[PDB]
Subunit: 298 residues, 3 copies
């Protein structure tokens, strides 16, 4: 895109603040940012806030979100669709033009781990170019296993294709399939979807801990067969809804846009790969590492 | 197929009648019919009754079906396999030759949303050419959420490939992935699997309604990540069996031939896309529209 | 691989023995063996014990497995990952070098139908070349439907690609998708993943029986839409965990590495195909036959 040539906008922090007991303001940007998706390979991504996937949003069940999108792209319109909310797509997920802003208000009344993405036609183009992320809606009454959990992380799976190639997006195999992690607190890792970061800088844990991961497969096109090597999921909650509760799974099937909360134990020290078990995708990048030490540091 | 050149058989209505409290007669045809699957693109489909997917069949749990197939194809044999029934495939799903008829009897003793299709080798060829559909078996005791439901529709997802090309069927990506809707009553829309009808003529609803969709992904080859934009499914029943009950899902994973009953609320007026969230397939046709008005008309 | 040219190692029996009430010794080989995967087509497979998929392992919930792998491959290292166990992947799933042995100890504390495979980088290469199988962990308290079951079989789905072709493994469609069956007792069939054996030599049953199948889709890359023609699954237990219980399904979605216990009735005599309903894969080999007779023999 000629107007994107030499555009590289620096990442903007997510702006959030609570304005009432069940009302929250969120402000995000649409912006064009270069991300290194594999060693030596830059993708000029269409992003929220200069991250792909975008920043993590965490709200509580029953919050109303008053959301503002500032479009920094000089030519392409962008929009936001949150899977968490009930809204009118043709009134509330509409396009925000270049250098313009839009504000929208809608409720999050279901707990879970939800995809968000741009809703601008062709949606495939916006998702594939990087406009995806996750919003977590915390359940009012928690999960039944909350007392047993020691440590929490967020992981997101996405694909990358040949740059802005609609034929490849529609008809091709992914070039790369990747994990990223987003921070539930400062001090947690917060990364972009790339083939290497979570191998070189693993997630940490301590021997004996019960780990909770909040996971979402944003696609755009593939399903995921999510598995942690060396363990079995003790509990699974499909889409993060506490009522959707499975036990003792080896692997969790996730549709495109599907989420889960998964919990498992790590019993021995060592390095534990995290994969999609569709091993063509794992080979193309989708392996993250969990390093489990006798202290929880390293 | 040389004997199909210039054959275009007009659609025949489904013939059904109840002959006892738990016995029902159904008569269907196998016939060759041109269907416009995308603007300007005719597919000479192998069909039941001149529709692809075929006509909707609705029976009650515990009905015995006395089914007749009349084969109008002048050269190719066809057969019927209903997923709803218990039967002997080699005695009851057998081929009916050209210009011949066959009658078969079998029970439907499980509730749900079931695929039907031809069982004639190679089955892939018959399904891909259009010989698929859905049979709904109503549960004797209903669903637990029946009192909350305001409006019901049936949607079916299928793929189309290059015309009668067994290499493409086996090894290729779909050319088109489409939705259709079938009528649960006269006045409901009843359409074929095409890229456009349910965009140009949306399904209707009224603000505030709880909507039930009975859905099946007939394939032949792909899985589906079924999602309604702007809402969250309040309740899901896998394969339409009332015992298989999930809540608060964003997206429902359907195998090839898999079904579901899904229920959701629409809270604001506007146009609500209905997608598979495998967005390469949505881009290739699989977007239907739900128009929600302040009165339920337009 | 030049050191594999003319290597064809004969199949070795699985060596197992119980050494305490909750301790079991298993000894397996890694070996190179020619298997006929389709008529006229030999694949020089990388195998456990000269079978692909490997031999069935059955243990009880809470058993500790003391596992030895003898690597008979003259050049390539191999390793074992059992999905059933809790272990440290970097200490317990490590490579065993050529002509060397390794012993590892880990517990199986969850019931179900679990994949096993090599863990040697690149894992995709080892799985695709044939290093996969299933371990069944029996539940201490059985399944709730155990009294109703008449007959049990194990079926495994896998893919084959162009021989040892990493480009094809990562980017290509499968050449063949196949079922095999493994014996739960001597007298049961025990076969390799090929396009023909379970068509030419069907599984047997008797009219009226409730059949239990323990199934796993080992991949490496595809999902499975598992279906028995002519029946409906009465009960399904996802991953073989008795708590994960669905009823009345037509088709079961399995991720890559996913398992299930499924149970169904066969009401009439005849031949009942067993398929993945992703019919491109069924066309490429994944159809097995169940022959149901008035006596249970033939
Ligand atoms: O309360 N609206 O930003
Ligand atoms: O065992 N997981 O690759
Ligand atoms: O009762 N048979 O058509
Ligand atoms: O939010 N659905 O595309
Ligand atoms: O008890 N170890 O083989
Ligand atoms: O009805 N199964 O192909
Ligand atoms: Cu406000
Ligand atoms: Cu965008
Ligand atoms: Cu979406
Ligand atoms: Cu009759
Ligand atoms: Cu046909
Ligand atoms: Cu079928
Ligand atoms: Cu020992
Ligand atoms: Cu190996
Ligand atoms: Cu594995």
């Amino acid at each position: 895109i000629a107007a994107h040539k030499g555009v590289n906008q620096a990442p903007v922090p997510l702006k959030m603040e609570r304005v009432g007991p069940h009302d929250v303001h969120i402000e995000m940007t649409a912006q064009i940012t270069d991300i290194e998706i594999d060693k030596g390979k830059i993708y000029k991504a269409w992003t929220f806030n200069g991250q792909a996937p975008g920043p993590l949003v965490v709200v509580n069940e029953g919050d109303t979100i008053h959301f503002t999108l500032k479009n920094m792209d000089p030519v392409v319109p962008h929009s936001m669709d949150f899977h968490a909310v009930h809204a009118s797509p043709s009134k509330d997920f509409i396009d925000v033009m270049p250098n313009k802003s839009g504000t929208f208000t809608y409720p999050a009344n279901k707990p879970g781990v939800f995809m968000y993405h741009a809703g601008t036609k062709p949606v495939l183009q916006h998702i594939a170019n990087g406009m995806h992320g996750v919003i977590i809606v915390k359940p009012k009454n928690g999960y039944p296993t909350d007392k047993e959990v020691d440590r929490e992380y967020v992981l997101i799976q996405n694909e990358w294709y040949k740059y802005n190639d609609m034929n490849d997006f529609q008809n091709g195999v992914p070039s790369y399939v990747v994990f990223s992690s987003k921070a539930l607190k400062p001090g947690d890792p917060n990364t972009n979807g790339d083939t290497f970061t979570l191998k070189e800088k693993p997630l940490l844990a301590k021997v004996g801990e019960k780990i909770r991961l909040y996971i979402n497969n944003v696609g755009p096109n593939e399903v995921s067969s999510f598995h942690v090597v060396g363990t079995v999921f003790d509990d699974v909650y499909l889409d993060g809804n506490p009522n959707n509760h499975l036990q003792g799974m080896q692997t969790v099937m996730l549709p495109a846009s599907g989420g889960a909360v998964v919990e498992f134990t790590v019993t021995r020290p060592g390095t534990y790969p995290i994969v999609t078990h569709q091993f063509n995708h794992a080979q193309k990048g989708a392996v993250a590492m969990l390093k489990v030490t006798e202290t929880g540091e390293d």
